[PDB]
Amino acid sequence: STGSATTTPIDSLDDAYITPVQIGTPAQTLNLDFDTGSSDLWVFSSETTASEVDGQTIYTPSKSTTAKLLSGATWSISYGDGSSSSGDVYTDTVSVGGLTVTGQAVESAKKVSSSFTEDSTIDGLLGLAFSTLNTVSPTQQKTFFDNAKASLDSPVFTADLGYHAPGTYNFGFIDTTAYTGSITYTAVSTKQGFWEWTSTGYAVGSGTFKSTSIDGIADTGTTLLYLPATVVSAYWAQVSGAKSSSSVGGYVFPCSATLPSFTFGVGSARIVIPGDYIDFGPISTGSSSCFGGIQSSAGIGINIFGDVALKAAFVVFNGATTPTLGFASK
Numbered sequence: 001s002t003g004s005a006t007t008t009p010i011d012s013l014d015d016a017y018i019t020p021v022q023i024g025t026p027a028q029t030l031n032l033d034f035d036t037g038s039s040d041l042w043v044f045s046s047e048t049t050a051s052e053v054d055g056q057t058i059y060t061p062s063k064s065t066t067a068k069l070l071s072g073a074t075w076s077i078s079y080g081d082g083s084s085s086s087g088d089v090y091t092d093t094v095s096v097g098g099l100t101v102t103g104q105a106v107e108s109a110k111k112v113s114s115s116f117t118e119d120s121t122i123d124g125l126l127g128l129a130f131s132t133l134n135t136v137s138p139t140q141q142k143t144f145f146d147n148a149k150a151s152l153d154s155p156v157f158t159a160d161l162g163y164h165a166p167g168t169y170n171f172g173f174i175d176t177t178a179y180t181g182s183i184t185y186t187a188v189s190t191k192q193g194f195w196e197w198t199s200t201g202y203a204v205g206s207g208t209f210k211s212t213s214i215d216g217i218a219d220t221g222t223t224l225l226y227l228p229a230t231v232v233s234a235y236w237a238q239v240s241g242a243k244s245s246s247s248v249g250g251y252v253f254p255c256s257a258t259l260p261s262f263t264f265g266v267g268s269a270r271i272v273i274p275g276d277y278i279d280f281g282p283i284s285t286g287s288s289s290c291f292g293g294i295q296s297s298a299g300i301g302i303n304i305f306g307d308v309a310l311k312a313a314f315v316v317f318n319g320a321t322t323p324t325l326g327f328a329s330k
């Protein structure tokens with residue numbers, strides 16, 4: 001089998017991407033944030049505290065003839081931005097772009113933190129990291145991809161995120177028309193539960209490529225590119241007036257600037273992030289200070305190749321017995 005679904009920016013800055021997902025019978029379509037940095041499929045629901053729901057579409061398990069309570073199961077997750085959610089668990093039929101899994105764990109939120117409430121466009125998350133990170137207790141549950149894998153034509157999914165435009169998540173096949181040149185595959189460590197890999201270096205604009213190993217994760221659920229402070233300083237040093245602002249919480253730059261590109265290495269290959277992709281706009285409405293799309297990972301404990309990096313590439317998440325990651329230009 002295969003599946004294919006379009007993923008769409010939630011706003012004009014590409015802060016996140018949402019993909020429609022069918023849950024239950026009859027189908028209830030929710031717009032979920034596909035997140036290769038976590039492993040829970042959770043949704044706003046009829047059980048979510050009313051004051052914490054503000055415009056989201058909710059899953060109502062009592063209206064699904066295929067929903068079953070997963071008795072005694074609970075979940076609770078907190079993300080690196082300090083947001084969180086928790087609740088109980090149903091199994092139900094879940095379909096993405098034509099690909100169906102029966103008995104998928106659907107984690108129903110009883111509580112969500114303010115950031116989730118405040119984002120009316122995201123109805124939940126669909127985790128695509130390794131199932132070892134799933135938070136359901138006392139019986140850990142599998143991701144949608146892990147459940148689908150064996151049935152897929154090839155045990156893979158691909159992320160083709162757009163810049164200020166829609167893109168595509170495919171399951172079970174590699175669309176050879178979606179990228180230029182070849183796909184370079186690189187080794188993955190699953191030891192921390194992530195799609196963790198080692199970039200071979202970087203360049204700033206037209207500058208000399210620096211060979212240096214950068215361990216990090218491919219994370220579709222993180223907006224920005226988080227890299228070591230040395231690398232990030234080298235980038236922003238090329239932008240007149242750019243500086244790290246403790247009050248704002250990262251590098252800012254004059255909105256009048258034209259940003260240089262940023263290149264990262266994948267083996268002997270190179271992915272080029274255009275400068276425009278690194279502009280996240282005014283720090284507050286009407287400001288002439290703009291927020292940078294490349295930020296230090298110093299506070300995070302891991303480097304993160306988030307959407308800023310991934311949307312410059314066609315990315316293969318290869319879930320073969322020995323997982324790997326592939327990157328192609330596009």
Ligand SMILES: O=C(NC[C@H]1CCCO1)C1CCCCC1
Binds near residue numbers: 035079081221222302
């Ligand atoms: O919290 C993180 N990113 C943002 C969250 C917000 C909701 C989806 O992702 C990352 C932090 C590094 C480890 C993997 C998760």
